[PDB]
Design goal:
The structure is cut from a larger assembly and holds chains A, B and C. Chain A is of the alpha+beta class. Helix content of chain A is about 30%, strand content about 30%. Chain A contains four helices and seven strands. In chain A, helix 2 packs parallel to helix 3. The relative contact order of chain A is 0.17. By secondary structure, chain B is an alpha/beta fold. In chain B, strands 4-3-5-6-7 form a five-stranded parallel beta sheet, sandwiched between helices. A two-stranded antiparallel sheet of chain B has the order 1-2. In chain B, strand 5 (about 155-160), helix 6 (about 165-175) and strand 6 (about 180-185) form a beta-alpha-beta unit. Chain C has a four-stranded antiparallel beta sheet, with helices on one face. A three-stranded mixed beta sheet of chain C has the order 1-2-3. The longest helix of chain C has 18 residues, at about 30-45. Chain C has helices at about 5-10, 30-45, 70-75, 80-95, 110-125, 130-140, and strands at about 50-55, 65-70, 100-105, 145-155, 165-170, 180-190, 195-200. Classes of the chains: A alpha+beta, B alpha/beta, C alpha+beta. The chains hardly touch. The complex binds magnesium ion (27 copies). The site of one magnesium ion has 2 residues of chain C, from loops. Chain C binds three RNA strands through strand 6 and strand 7. It is classed as ribosome.
RNA sequence: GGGCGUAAAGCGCACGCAGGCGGUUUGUUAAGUCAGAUGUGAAAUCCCCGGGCUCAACCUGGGAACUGCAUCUGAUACUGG
RNA sequence: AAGGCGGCCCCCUGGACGAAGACUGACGCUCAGGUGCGAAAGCGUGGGGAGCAAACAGGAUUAGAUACCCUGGUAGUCCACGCCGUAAACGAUGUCGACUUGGAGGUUGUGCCCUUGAGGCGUGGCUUCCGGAGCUAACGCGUUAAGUCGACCGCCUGGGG
RNA sequence: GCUGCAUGGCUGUCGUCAGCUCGUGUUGUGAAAUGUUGGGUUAAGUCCCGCAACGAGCGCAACCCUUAUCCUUUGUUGCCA
């Protein structure tokens, strides 16, 4: 019922006394389509084995995101080691406007309308981390209402 | 459980003022002759409620695992667990004992098979060679995983006798979302701990007092369920 | 370094000799040559018959040849016409009458000759070696191999320099004597050279 | 809407004029700041709602926009005097 | 302040920090240009020259050895007065101010406690080491920040050229 | 007849030296790390203790051969209390 898709696959190497030892890495994102999204990173000698490992890694380490209506509550800015991510909620019907890694993360999470831009490095492993960081730190008016002790007359 | 009971048992001692954790300030009264004092007026009320929710977790037919590897309270934690029919670890907390439960269970079935086919089973085929080897494997697995042989699953909650000295267990519990009931000393770190119990753990009479409180609660849970 | 032949080392223990006949020094080399003639002639014209093992027996007044193969239908023909022609020629090779007993192997992929000859044959049919070795390994594990190891070496992929390529799944306890390792070696004659293929199959101990 | 320990990048160090910035309270001013109004900001163009070439490009009515400037009146929290 | 400063004594002289008050009353921070200071080497004039030692000479080494090694050896290193204004002039980290968990030292003041004592409790200045949160590409920095922030100045914009 | 510097097969060498790896877990943004390090011990990555590691595999060892002791079985072509 939940959706899963593969971000990128990369071949890595570890040289030994005999020579190189080739390996394959898989970055995947798993989301239920509501705002519960996670990512998994796995390593294996074979591409099917590597992608499978990332699949179970993503089912654990799931997070929850509070969405308004298929979109973000407010503009959000997610920063990881070398990647800067700016996402802001857009109007209905505008669709998803984001880079490769961010679009997959966003679409499996369940955000249909969003304007998202990536600054800094565009390494898939780090932009996915930055995107997850933004969806965390974004908040909901009811949790803010309890946070400030001011009820929900703000909106 | 009371003010005077813990004071008499001497749980109010903490470590030296050279080993303290700046996160312990709310739970330190003063330092006398470079010995911190843990405020009983603060630890008792949260000790009682932590014991209270321990009763609630036991009410759901839970599995409570008593983790202590210090030589101070080895026999202390073992008898307290067995008396209340709960499970324990005493020799040494194996890294990945919670997270890597599948491989651990493989060792446990291996452990389980050997007693029933050697001791209460048959003593044939000794060959006089591997008998000592096989009994030694039994003893190694008995001290290591003997206390968790029957669990067949993940613990519902953990009771930890030192947060800092079993931080590996604490981080695995946090990763797996297992509630933590840990006693924290001056030199420990309570961040990973979920229901902190400020108190001493270097005293046999103190640790038996603390294990007696948890034992009374869990048996009350069982009897209340009955 | 170099390895002992796993069949040869365990020949006296668990591996039945291909030749299980006795005589004196007078006809030792003579009947050894006859076994060579029989085996090479048999293999050359049963290259398609998936011949795996040839067991030559010499009862006191005849020769018996047991052919362990995977395709008895081809090696017998219709009503046994082919086995009688092989009888004529094989008997004339050694100058004595010959009995032929054909034994079938239900699992070809667990015998080291069929897997080796198949991998070799794919090379001159221009199948890429990495996929070929992987196909063999997967077949063995599915059909119940306890351990597998395949060695394809020499002029891989038309390169200038020969490379060694091997891939091991499961369990191959060569140094264990009671271990049952069926080993065979086969060769591939390709337009860019000649390729050696080695297969170890472990199928339990004692 | 970027950086400067090691990737390019902290003057060798300091004093110091111009300049930039400036603790805290009261009064006053109203220069910055903000609000209102008035006059301008040509038409075409761009955008919105329509109209006519059989459609379309194209042409075209109204509107919005051109929030920029200037003046007058007012507010005094912050900056400045 | 940096560059730097090491026998002892005397003369002249600058800054720093601590204790308890008194006093002025925003007189402050930063700083383009400008000015001043600025290791060693070097330059000018006049001295001095023990040791050391560019250059240079000889002897080895080496296929060669305009070097490394050895024996010597002039400038220079030393002083006075000018000039030079450059260093991996480095903490490779501009100055000023505020805030943010800790621990052990060193060094210099200073208030107390039966000052009994060859004993402890406080408070400052400066200074090393380790490390928390945080930050960082990472190494690491971590109350003396590369953390959280403000003021101003300098600088950077691919590698060569 | 040429090219082992196109190769297969086979062999020498360090060296019978004790190493070479994987699964799951954990760590690291990541390549990867950990396991395999450390206190000892062993002929040995042999074993033990500690240890974010828990196990597992190929190698070490064991199974094969011979010699060292005894018991039982058959006694000629071997032995003679
Ligand atoms: Mg050999
Ligand atoms: Mg830049
Ligand atoms: Mg450089
Ligand atoms: Mg630089
Ligand atoms: Mg500097
Ligand atoms: Mg002011
Ligand atoms: Mg005004
Ligand atoms: Mg106009
Ligand atoms: Mg000089
Ligand atoms: Mg001079
Ligand atoms: Mg010299
Ligand atoms: Mg210097
Ligand atoms: Mg310079
Ligand atoms: Mg510099
Ligand atoms: Mg200044
Ligand atoms: Mg540090
Ligand atoms: Mg060669
Ligand atoms: Mg792993
Ligand atoms: Mg990870
Ligand atoms: Mg190793
Ligand atoms: Mg390693
Ligand atoms: Mg290592
Ligand atoms: Mg060791
Ligand atoms: Mg050895
Ligand atoms: Mg081993
Ligand atoms: Mg270990
Ligand atoms: Mg061996």
């Amino acid at each position: 019922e939940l959706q899963e898709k593969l971000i990128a696959v990369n071949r890595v190497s570890k040289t030994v006394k005999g020579g190189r030892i080739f390996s394959f890495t898989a970055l995947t994102v798993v989301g239920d389509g509501n705002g519960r999204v996670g990512f998994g990173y796995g390593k294996a000698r074979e591409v099917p084995a590597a992608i499978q490992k990332a699949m179970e890694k993503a089912r654990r380490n799931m997070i929850n995101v509070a969405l308004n209506n298929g979109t973000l509550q407010h503009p959000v800015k997610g920063v990881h080691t070398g990647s800067r991510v700016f996402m802001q909620p857009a109007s209905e019907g505008t669709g998803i406007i984001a880079g490769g890694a961010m679009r997959a993360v966003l679409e499996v999470a369940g955000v249909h309308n969003v304007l998202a831009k990536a600054y800094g490095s565009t390494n898939p492993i780090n932009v996915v981390r930055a995107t997850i960081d933004g969806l965390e730190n974004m908040n909901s008016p009811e949790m803010v209402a309890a946070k400030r002790g001011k009820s929900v007359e703000e909106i | 459980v009371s003010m005077r009971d813990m004071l008499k048992a001497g749980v109010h001692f903490g470590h030296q003022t050279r080993y303290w954790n700046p996160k312990m300030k709310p739970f330190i009264f003063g330092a006398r002759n470079k010995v911190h004092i843990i405020n009983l007026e603060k630890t008792v009320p949260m000790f009682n409620e932590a014991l209270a929710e321990l009763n609630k977790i036991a009410s759901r037919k839970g599995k409570i695992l008593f983790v202590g590897t210090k030589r101070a309270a080895s026999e202390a934690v073992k008898d307290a667990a067995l008396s209340c029919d709960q499970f324990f670890v005493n020799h040494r907390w194996l890294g990945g004992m919670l997270t890597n439960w599948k491989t651990v269970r493989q060792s446990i079935k291996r452990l389980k098979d050997l007693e029933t086919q050697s001791q209460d089973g048959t003593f044939d085929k000794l060959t006089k060679k591997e008998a000592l080897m096989r009994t030694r494997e039994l003893e190694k697995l008995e001290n290591s995983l003997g206390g968790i042989k029957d669990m067949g699953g993940l613990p519902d909650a953990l009771f930890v006798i030192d947060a800092d000295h079993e931080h590996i267990a604490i981080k695995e519990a946090n990763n797996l979302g297992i509630p933590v009931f840990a006693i924290v000393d001056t030199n420990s770190d309570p961040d990973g701990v979920d229901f902190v119990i400020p108190g001493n753990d270097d005293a046999i009479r103190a640790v038996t007092l603390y294990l007696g409180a948890v034992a009374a609660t869990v048996r009350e849970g069982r009897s209340q369920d009955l | 370094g170099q390895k002992v032949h796993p069949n040869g080392i365990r020949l006296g223990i668990v591996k039945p000799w291909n030749s299980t006949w006795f005589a004196n020094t007078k006809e030792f080399a003579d009947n050894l040559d006859s076994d060579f003639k029989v085996r090479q002639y048999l293999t050359k014209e049963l290259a398609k018959a998936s011949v795996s093992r040839i067991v030559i027996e010499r009862p006191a007044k005849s020769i018996r040849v047991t052919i362990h193969t995977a395709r008895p239908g081809i090696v017998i023909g219709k009503k046994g016409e082919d086995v009688e022609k092989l009888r004529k020629v094989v008997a004339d090779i050694a100058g004595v009458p010959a009995q032929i007993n054909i034994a079938e192997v239900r699992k070809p992929e667990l015998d080291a000759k069929l897997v080796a000859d198949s991998i070799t044959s794919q090379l001159e049919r221009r199948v890429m070696f990495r996929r070929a070795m992987k196909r063999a390994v997967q077949n063995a594990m599915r059909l119940g191999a306890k351990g597998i190891k395949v060695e394809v070496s020499g002029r891989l992929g038309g390169a200038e320099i020969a490379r060694t390529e091997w891939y091991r799944e499961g369990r191959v306890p060569l140094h264990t004597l009671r271990a049952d390792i069926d080993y065979n070696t086969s060769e591939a004659h390709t337009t860019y050279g000649v390729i050696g293929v080695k297969v170890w199959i472990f199928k339990g101990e004692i």
